[PDB]
Design a binder for this molecule. Structure first.
Ligand SMILES: *[C@@H]1O[C@H](CO)[C@@H](O)[C@H](O)[C@H]1NC(C)=O
Ligand SMILES: *[C@@H]1O[C@H](CO)[C@@H](O)[C@H](O)[C@H]1NC(C)=O
Ligand SMILES: *[C@@H]1O[C@H](CO)[C@@H](O)[C@H](O)[C@H]1NC(C)=O
Ligand SMILES: *[C@@H]1O[C@H](CO)[C@@H](O)[C@H](O)[C@H]1NC(C)=O
Lengths: 125, 107, 107, 125
C-alpha cells in the first residue's frame, strides 16, 4: 500500500537506527557474547521491524497526513530515522542477555541478516 | 502460535517483554492496549514486543502498547494487575484470544 | 477494604459465578462486562451479584452481567480465564479500578 | 426521576416475584433452616432488588420507550412482574445454604423486612 521508494527509505533508516543502538549497547555489554549471539541480536533488530511494521505504518500515515503537503521520499527517511532512534531496543538486549534468552542462531535468521535492509520483507495489514 | 509468554518487570519504569514463537494460517494479530488497538505481524519463528506500564502520548516511542491498569486485586494488597488481551484471527476457524497479565508489587 | 469482594468462581460455564461485597462516599459502582456496562448499588451491609460465563441476549434475565473471555493464558492449557473489571467512583479521591478473575477448567 | 406510583408498581411486583420463588425453593429446601435463616433469605430478596435497581431501570426504560406511547402504571406492573419471575434467585439460595453462608440476621435486615415492599428505598443512577 506504499510506494517502494518510500518503503525502502523507511526500512533502511529503521534498521540503521536499531543497529546503531545495538552497537552502542555492545560496546558496554558485548565482551562475553559469542559471535552468533551478536548475529542473533542483529537479527532481533530486523525482526522487530517486521513484527511491528503494521503499527509503524499507522504512526507513519498519521505523521504523513499531518505534513501540510504531499510527502517526498525524504519525509520517509526522516520518519524512519525517528523510529530507528526512538524504539528502545536495549530493553530487549538487556533482558535477553540477563535471562540467557538470546535466541539460538538459525538459518532463517542468517537469511534475514544477509539481506539488504531495503529488501527485508514486510507485511502491510 | 501456541508458544508465547510475557516477562514482567518489577518496576513500572521498565516495560514488560512479550515473546512469541510461531511454527507452521494466521491472518491477523491485534493487541488490545489502553492506548489503542495495536496490530502486529507474527512472522515465522520468534517475535518480540515491549509493553509499557505507563503512558505518555507525547514522549512514547512509535507503536508502543501500554497495559490496561493498574487494577486492584481482591484479597491481595501487595500487588496490582496490568493486562492487555490479544486477538488472533485464523484463515479457517474461530479467532483465539489471549490474556497477557503482569502483577506489579505495590509501593 | 473497598477492593475486597468475595469471589466464588464456578467449575462449569453453565453455573454463574457469585460475588458478594460488604459495605470518601461511594457515588457509583460500574461493572465492565462483555455485554456492557452494568451499574450496581452497594448498600450498607451485604450485596450479592451473579456473573454469567455465557450470553444469550434473547433468553437471559434482565440486567445480567457476562464475563469477558474465555482467554488463554501462557504455558497453561488446562484452564482459561474469564474476567470483568469494576470502577468505583468516590465523592472524594480518584476512582478505584478492580479486576475480577475466574479461571475455568478447559473442557 | 420516576413517578412514585410507577416505582411502587415495580418494587411490589419484583419483591412479590422473588418471594414466590423463595416459597417454591423453601418447600423443597426449607426443612433444616431456622426461622432467622429464612428471614435472612427474604431480606436477600429485597436487598437484591436494591443492589440491582439502577440496572433494572436501564432495562425498564428500554422496554417502556418501545411502547410507542405514554406509559401507564399497568406497564410498570407487567415489567416488574417479569423481572420478578425471571431473576433466578435460587442460584443464591442454593449457594448460601450449601456453603452455610446464609447471612446472620441483623437489625438493618429486619428493618428492611418490616417495610412495605412499596417503601423499600432504591437509588437511581
Ligand atoms: C478491548 O477489549 C475490551 C475488553 O477488555 C473491550 O471492552 C474493548 O471494546 C476492546 N477495544 C477495542 C478497541 O477493540
Ligand atoms: C498476591 O499475588 C501475587 C501474584 O499473583 C502472589 O505472588 C502473592 O502470593 C499474592 N498474595 C496473596 C496474599 O494472595
Ligand atoms: C471496558 O474495559 C475495557 C478494558 O478492559 C475498555 O477497553 C472498554 O472501553 C471498557 N468499556 C466501557 C463501556 O467503558
Ligand atoms: C494453570 O493455572 C491454574 C490456575 O491458574 C492451575 O490450577 C493449574 O495448576 C495451572 N496448570 C498446571 C499444569 O498446574
Amino acid at each position: 500500500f506504499l510506494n517502494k521508494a518510500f518503503e525502502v527509505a523507511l526500512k533502511v533508516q529503521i534498521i540503521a537506527g536499531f543497529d546503531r543502538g545495538l552497537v552502542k549497547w555492545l560496546r558496554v555489554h558485548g565482551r562475553t557474547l559469542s559471535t552468533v549471539q551478536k548475529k542473533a541480536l542483529y537479527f532481533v533488530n530486523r525482526r522487530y521491524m517486521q513484527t511491528h511494521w503494521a503499527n509503524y505504518m499507522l504512526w507513519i500515515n498519521k505523521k504523513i497526513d499531518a505534513l501540510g503537503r504531499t510527502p517526498v521520499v525524504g519525509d520517509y527517511t526522516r520518519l524512519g530515522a525517528e523510529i530507528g532512534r526512538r524504539i528502545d531496543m536495549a530493553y530487549f538486549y538487556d533482558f535477553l542477555k540477563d535471562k540467557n534468552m538470546i535466541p539460538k542462531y538459525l538459518p532463517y535468521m542468517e537469511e534475514i541478516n544477509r539481506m539488504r535492509p531495503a529488501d527485508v520483507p514486510v507485511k502491510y495489514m | 502460535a501456541a508458544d508465547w509468554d510475557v516477562y514482567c518487570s518489577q518496576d513500572e519504569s521498565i516495560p514488560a517483554k512479550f515473546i512469541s514463537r510461531l511454527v507452521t494460517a494466521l491472518e491477523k494479530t491485534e493487541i488490545n492496549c489502553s492506548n489503542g488497538l495495536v496490530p502486529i505481524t507474527q512472522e515465522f519463528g520468534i517475535n518480540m514486543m515491549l509493553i509499557q506500564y505507563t503512558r505518555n502520548e507525547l514522549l512514547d516511542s512509535p507503536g508502543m502498547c501500554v497495559f490496561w491498569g493498574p487494577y486492584s486485586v481482591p484479597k491481595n494488597d501487595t500487588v496490582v494487575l496490568y493486562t492487555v488481551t490479544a486477538r488472533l484471527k485464523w484463515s479457517e476457524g474461530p479467532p483465539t484470544n489471549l490474556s497477557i497479565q503482569c502483577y506489579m508489587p505495590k509501593s
